[PDB]
Amino acid sequence: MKQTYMIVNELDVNKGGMTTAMLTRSKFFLDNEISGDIITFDFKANYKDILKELVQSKKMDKRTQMHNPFIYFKNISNLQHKKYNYTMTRNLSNLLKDSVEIKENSRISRFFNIMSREYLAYKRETEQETIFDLFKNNLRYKRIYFYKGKIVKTEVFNSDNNLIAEQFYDDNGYLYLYRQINPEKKSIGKTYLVCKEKQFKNNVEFCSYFLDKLIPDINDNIIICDGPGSFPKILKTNHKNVKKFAVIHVNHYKNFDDTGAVKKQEDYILRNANKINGVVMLTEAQKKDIIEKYKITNAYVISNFINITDDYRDKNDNKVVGHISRLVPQKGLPYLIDVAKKVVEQDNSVEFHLYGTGEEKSKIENLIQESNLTNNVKLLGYTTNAIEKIKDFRCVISTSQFEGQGLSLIEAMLLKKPVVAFDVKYGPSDFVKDGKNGYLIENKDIKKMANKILKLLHDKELSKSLGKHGRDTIIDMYQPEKLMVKWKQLFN
Ligand SMILES: [Cl-]
Ligand SMILES: [Cl-]
Ligand SMILES: [Cl-]
Ligand SMILES: [Cl-]
């Protein structure tokens, strides 16, 4: 009879560990007769296709449902009419009625009012999607989005081409939701629900009302806030009986700040711990650090559910050092290239395969070229099947400067791969056993990391032994039954 709702701002493919962790948790909860649902708050006209991909890629259980304010209010609005209203598309065809189409590309075209001698619109047509940008005095004031033959959204722009309003349309062609946007802050302001003729101060108030309409106020309903940015929305609900929990997925300390400063979103959660049933941390070390500074009495440690990869035959016998992560400063990728320099200096046969996408791509490319390591260090971009790539690595490394739990290393260890990681807050210290399943290195010590990389690369038998112990360590340490008991204890 227990229903859980796991909250994050958005769900997509090629998302990080947090979304994977929520989806894994849902699967295990559902295997234990506990409904686990996902709730998002963003607009995606193609959410159906994303959810379809997630379930077919086996990342999402078929019984895991996603609720969303746009989907929710659109389905309710669809009941209000029987026929499709074409007023919007008629208004567009009326604007371009006295205009000539000048095809600029195969996809792009421009509309020129023969009479007004003014270019009124730009159109871009792709597969299942047509965009119209509307212009007056050579200034865009509106964008119209056609998806699957119908208008799904319009955007209003000011004279600076900054978004000032958004409008959302139901499957009958009617406006059901519109919101003001702060032009320079790009923050969501006054939101208006057409059906209920209801106004909201901001997106937080609107999403809190959505949660009040979606989740019945009973004790058997549980809210688990995973997305730190979503916490205000769960806190500002009118629920009095629904159990509310917050999961800290990351080192709460301000990134690359040793002043003891804490991230704003995590600070807000921890200062409001008394207003919720409990805060869940992934490691005992993190609980200790938080309890020391915040004096929280409802802090609990439950590790992420670990999907135990099936045993396999390791055929590969190469010198490949692997790394799969989003290209973000946290992953200490500049330290990775310094390690690579020292490793290639000792063996030019060594290759560093870096999978993932992110903002640091350009910086890392420059470092690789500057260090003349283009033949050894390779940015292999985004992969769908990371497990397959890991099966072909000799070892996997982590130069990460902060971690919440450190699941990338756990995944590698389960695939019988040895691991060399920097000892960092809430990371390897729990599972990496020095000389047994890999090597825990002093943070920012490139030489010590390079030494252990070469050690493993030169001793294939050592690598295999360490790898075997890695899988065994994770199997004995992370048993899903233990974690399920801890969750059920919180729900009771
Ligand atoms: Cl009608
Ligand atoms: Cl917001
Ligand atoms: Cl911050
Ligand atoms: Cl990770």
Side-chain angles (χ1 to χ4, degrees), residues 4-13 16-26 28-32 35-51 53-57 60-61 63-79 81-82 84-87 89-93 95-96 98-101 107-113 119-126 129-130 132-135 138-184 187-189 191-195 200 202-212 214-217 219-235 237-239 241-242 244-253 255-258 260-263 265-270 272-273 276-287 289-290 294 296-309 311-312 314 320-325 327-336 338-340 343-344 347-348 351-356 358-360 362 364-365 367-368 377 379 381-383 386 391-393 395-415 417-432 434-435 437-439 443 445 449-450 453-454 456 458-459 462-463 466-467 469-473 476-478 480 483-487 489-491:
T4 73
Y5 301 92
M6 301 166 206
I7 279 104
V8 71
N9 189 55
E10 89 167 277
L11 216 63
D12 210 350
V13 314
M18 183 189 303
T19 56
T20 308
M22 299 166 64
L23 292 177
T24 301
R25 189 197 304 144
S26 175
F28 280 102
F29 278 12
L30 278 158
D31 293 343
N32 284 264
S35 349
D37 278 343
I38 313 288
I39 303 179
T40 59
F41 301 120
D42 66 313
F43 172 67
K44 276 190 201 97
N46 64 21
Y47 245 138
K48 177 261 301 181
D49 284 328
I50 286 141
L51 294 184
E53 183 165 348
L54 284 174
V55 59
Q56 288 177 339
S57 68
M60 192 173 196
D61 197 285
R63 302 164 291 166
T64 307
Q65 210 82 345
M66 196 205 64
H67 312 280
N68 182 276
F70 297 88
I71 305 179
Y72 183 77
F73 291 117
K74 182 186 65 182
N75 288 335
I76 296 163
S77 190
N78 284 329
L79 296 170
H81 299 280
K82 295 196 279 266
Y84 194 95
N85 186 214
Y86 290 98
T87 294
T89 190
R90 284 186 201 267
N91 292 342
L92 180 51
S93 314
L95 184 85
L96 309 174
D98 31 28
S99 90
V100 61
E101 191 163 5
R107 298 215 179 270
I108 294 162
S109 86
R110 195 174 201 194
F111 292 85
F112 175 72
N113 211 263
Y119 295 100
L120 288 196
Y122 263 115
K123 161 200 177 114
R124 189 169 164 268
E125 184 168 352
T126 74
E129 185 209 305
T130 306
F132 282 86
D133 282 1
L134 264 42
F135 287 82
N138 249 97
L139 295 166
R140 183 176 63 173
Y141 64 87
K142 207 204 310 221
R143 168 169 281 198
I144 307 141
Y145 289 97
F146 284 89
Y147 188 62
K148 303 298 196 191
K150 60 191 152 189
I151 184 189
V152 293
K153 194 204 179 177
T154 50
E155 290 173 344
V156 179
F157 304 96
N158 64 17
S159 52
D160 313 316
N161 221 1
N162 283 142
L163 185 62
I164 57 168
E166 288 178 320
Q167 297 87 40
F168 307 90
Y169 301 91
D170 62 27
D171 297 301
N172 296 325
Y174 286 90
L175 179 63
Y176 78 94
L177 184 68
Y178 63 103
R179 46 200 211 169
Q180 307 174 15
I181 311 283
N182 296 287
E184 294 184 39
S187 50
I188 304 143
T191 303
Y192 305 87
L193 254 183
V194 169
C195 284
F200 309 97
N202 44 46
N203 188 44
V204 179
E205 208 162 75
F206 166 64
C207 294
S208 299
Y209 169 84
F210 158 63
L211 296 178
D212 284 326
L214 179 78
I215 306 159
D217 197 17
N219 199 54
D220 310 286
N221 288 346
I222 298 116
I223 287 174
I224 308 166
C225 192
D226 296 286
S230 287
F231 184 69
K233 302 164 161 93
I234 83 135
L235 198 67
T237 58
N238 292 315
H239 295 121
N241 313 302
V242 169
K244 304 193 206 167
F245 298 95
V247 185
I248 310 297
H249 289 273
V250 294
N251 183 355
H252 63 296
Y253 285 118
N255 293 348
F256 306 101
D257 178 283
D258 330 280
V262 40
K263 293 198 270 250
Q265 300 181 143
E266 277 81 14
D267 175 70
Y268 186 75
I269 298 165
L270 298 173
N272 285 274
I276 57 166
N277 297 66
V279 196
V280 183
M281 291 86 177
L282 308 174
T283 69
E284 287 284 350
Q286 182 144 33
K287 176 168 158 171
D289 290 352
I290 281 158
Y294 285 94
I296 291 175
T297 48
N298 63 32
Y300 311 99
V301 171
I302 318 174
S303 148
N304 285 122
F305 283 99
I306 306 297
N307 264 336
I308 313 292
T309 72
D311 218 354
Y312 73 98
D314 184 29
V320 190
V321 193
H323 179 88
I324 312 208
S325 86
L327 305 178
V328 287
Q330 158 204 16
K331 302 306 183 176
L333 292 159
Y335 301 111
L336 209 145
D338 306 329
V339 171
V343 169
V344 172
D347 177 46
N348 338 286
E351 258 154 30
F352 286 73
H353 289 184
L354 273 69
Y355 290 82
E359 63 225 47
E360 289 253 291
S362 8
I364 303 315
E365 278 167 337
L367 286 179
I368 288 167
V377 194
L379 253 51
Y382 173 71
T383 179
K391 292 173 160 193
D392 299 314
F393 299 151
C395 66
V396 160
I397 86 166
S398 165
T399 47
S400 194
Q401 294 302 292
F402 44 93
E403 279 295 324
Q405 177 158 338
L407 297 183
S408 302
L409 294 159
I410 286 167
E411 180 159 71
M413 284 163 75
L414 271 173
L415 291 158
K417 296 311 165 159
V419 285
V420 177
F422 278 153
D423 192 25
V424 291
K425 274 318 198 161
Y426 334 130
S429 74
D430 283 16
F431 44 87
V432 170
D434 218 334
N437 55 36
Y439 303 102
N443 187 34
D445 206 318
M449 181 161 269
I453 289 319
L454 290 155
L456 288 170
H458 294 158
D459 202 341
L462 171 78
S463 304
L466 298 208
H469 187 250
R471 176 173 180 96
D472 298 332
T473 301
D476 114 275
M477 201 161 291
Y478 306 109
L483 308 174
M484 193 58 61
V485 170
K486 296 160 176 249
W487 274 113
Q489 272 172 340
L490 285 202
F491 300 158

